[PDB]
Design a protein around this nucleic acid. Sequence first.
DNA 1: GTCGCGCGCCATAAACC
DNA 2: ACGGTTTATGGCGCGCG
Lengths: 63, 53, 65, 66
Amino acid sequence: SHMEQRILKFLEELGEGKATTAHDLSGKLGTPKKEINRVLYSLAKKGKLQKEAGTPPLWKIAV
Amino acid sequence: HMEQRILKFTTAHDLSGKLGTPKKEINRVLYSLAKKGKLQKEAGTPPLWKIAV
Amino acid sequence: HMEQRILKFLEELGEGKATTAHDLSGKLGTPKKEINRVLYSLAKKGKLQKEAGTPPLWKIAVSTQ
Amino acid sequence: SHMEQRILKFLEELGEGKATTAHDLSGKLGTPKKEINRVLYSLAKKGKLQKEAGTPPLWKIAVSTQ
DNA sequence: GTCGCGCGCCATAAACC
DNA sequence: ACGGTTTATGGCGCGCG
């Protein structure tokens, strides 16, 4: 929920309909993709984030 | 719709009758929900459950 | 080699009906890790189609043209 | 079942207070990770091994319980 | 009768930079 | 005498009869 917050913050910042990727997040936060992804996927089951299947997947805030 | 009802309503095996749902499906929404911080798993055999206030 | 086995096995099942990687793992006498490894490789090669689920169901790839 | 014996042996031959992952046991023992974990988890219930929390879990020969 | 399991995941090939 | 490092649905925690 700290790093969940780093990520959520960043998404909300970066546009209001925008998406992004684990690789993008990882750069803009000096964090291994593994970590970013650990949290992105957690957040998704929690209903918080919305994921668009793809190579790589695209992540945006949900309702 | 399950997540919703699961809330309004103990064991998963015991949840299969009250809502008429296969145990698999209940254990799914349980472990998920406790991962959402809302529920909380007790160590029984089988495991027991209760809404974390 | 293991691929054409799975395919061959997905022929003798009647068009429409699908199967799981556990099921295959038994029938074909092969560890599930290898089965799935190959299954996911055939779907991506086009030969097969994956119907994501719990567990996922696998059948011959169906043209959508 | 000489799998238990082989793993306990490997975890002993690794050193004092030292741990390792099941992926690693499967590698060296040349044994499917499926069986390795089935067994690892088994030895932990029997009390012989302890499972350190992690991703993945780390294992080592127990040192506390009776 | 615990069990939620979706798992292929690299003893990797290809792709990036 | 030389392409090192990251990706992939790569998140994996899995042991399940």
